From Swiss-Prot, chain A:
Optimum pH is 8.3. There are no coordination bonds that occur between IspD and magnesium in any of the complexes examined to date. The gene is ispD. InterPro entries: IspD, IspD/TarI, IspD/TarI_cytidylyltransf_bact, ISPD_synthase_CS, Nucleotide-diphossugar_trans. It is an enzyme of class 2 (transferase). Belongs to the IspD/TarI cytidylyltransferase family. IspD subfamily. The record marks 143, 199 as: Positions MEP for the nucleophilic attack. Keywords: Cobalt, Isoprene biosynthesis, Magnesium, Manganese, Nucleotidyltransferase, Transferase. Its cofactor is Mg(2+); Mn(2+); Co(2+). PROSITE patterns: ISPD. The record marks 13 as: Transition state stabilizer. HAMAP family: IspD. This is 2-C-methyl-D-erythritol 4-phosphate cytidylyltransferase.
Length: 215, 218
């Protein structure tokens, strides 16, 4: 039942701090919380100097690898260092607000499924599609069965390995890990997660993450 | 010439618009965000026949608030509201449950009246990766392209004439109506997407309430 986590961490928002720790430390620590998660593999770009100065740089359950050209190389590098783990948990560096109950709910999949899946949250707003290249609404987009893709993303290590290898080599346009499976013809599951599992991308996200984390 | 009428559909177990943040209900917070703009000379609130929550708010007697009666759909309500709209050449229709509207977004939207013959809505680009589930199932069909994908927000700002007609023609014809702009779209019209802040949220859920309180304090 052993699980390796992989964080593609590769002035970056994961090195911003909420209180005690960086966003990167919150995210990582939320994964290490769950007992099935034995190690966390963190991809870091070789330019990155901030990582080495954090306590996580010498934590015994963390391994660092050189991040690659794209998200997907990093993750493949991470998989290759997951040792002997059979399932693999991919998590964004900048998602520090993960709860243990979505995480446990996601981890339940290694016994119910052969594909794996992702945390996600149903879409609530009414969605519009712009006229291509324009300022103007073309039509309303149907939101039933529309989901926000979140992370962690939880998969059989070898399946992940195979879908990523093929999409990188065929030069497919990859966004999340789930999209690499999709590209190879798989259909990973949507596990409903809390909507407060946000990615800190803009200045004001930081205030929000902090709000969410203290709640 | 530049005077604007605002319409707020307030119908359709506690209704969330009547949840409170500090002093006021959501509705009061929303309506007040409308009243602040110089151009918003009045707000017409559509309230349903048998509701005793409204008359108890400072709003049941504001000099710039007209009440009118609720309808069976959001669409009917607004149509009702436009009759109370006076001599306004443009109508601003806003959710009662969207209390966090900021002034700078509203002035960008109002500006359209100078520029558009269609009008437009506040919106926010989608920044997240979106998935479509297989129908009736809980697995990813595919990734939905977020390029040109936008959250629809309010207010929605339209010329009163065009708003009246497209809402009319869409109800008469049995169109699937979600928001005012979608009454326009069914009628073959293409209203502008005006970007506003993403903290313009809708209070529906229970956890929704504290996030709004946070955003209001900001
Ligand atoms: Cl927790
Ligand atoms: Cl949403
Ligand atoms: Cl003005
Ligand atoms: Cl403001
Ligand atoms: Cl989003």
């Amino acid at each position: 039942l052993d699980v390796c986590a992989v964080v593609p961490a590769a002035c970056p928002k994961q090195y911003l701090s909420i209180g005690n720790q960086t966003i990167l430390e919150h995210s990582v620590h939320a994964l290490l919380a769950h007992p099935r998660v034995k190690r966390v593999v963190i991809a870091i770009s070789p330019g990155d100097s901030r990582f080495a100065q954090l306590p996580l740089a010498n934590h015994p359950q963390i391994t660092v690898v050189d991040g690659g050209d794209e998200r997907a190389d990093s993750v493949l590098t991470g998989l290759k260092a997951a040792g002997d783990a059979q399932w693999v948990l991919v998590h964004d560096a900048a998602r520090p607000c993960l709860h243990q109950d979505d995480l446990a709910r996601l981890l339940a999949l290694s016994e119910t499924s052969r594909t794996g899946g992702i945390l996600a949250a149903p879409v609530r707003d009414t969605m519009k599609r712009a006229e291509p290249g324009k300022n103007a609404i073309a039509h309303t987009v149907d939101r039933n069965g529309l989901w926000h893709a979140l992370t962690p993303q939880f998969f059989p290590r070898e399946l992940l390995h195979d879908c990523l290898t093929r999409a990188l080599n065929e030069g497919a346009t990859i966004t999340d890990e789930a999209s690499a499976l999709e590209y190879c013809g798989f259909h990973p599951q949507l596990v409903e997660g809390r909507a407060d599992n946000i990615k800190v991308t803009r200045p004001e996200d930081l205030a929000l993450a902090e709000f969410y984390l203290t709640r």
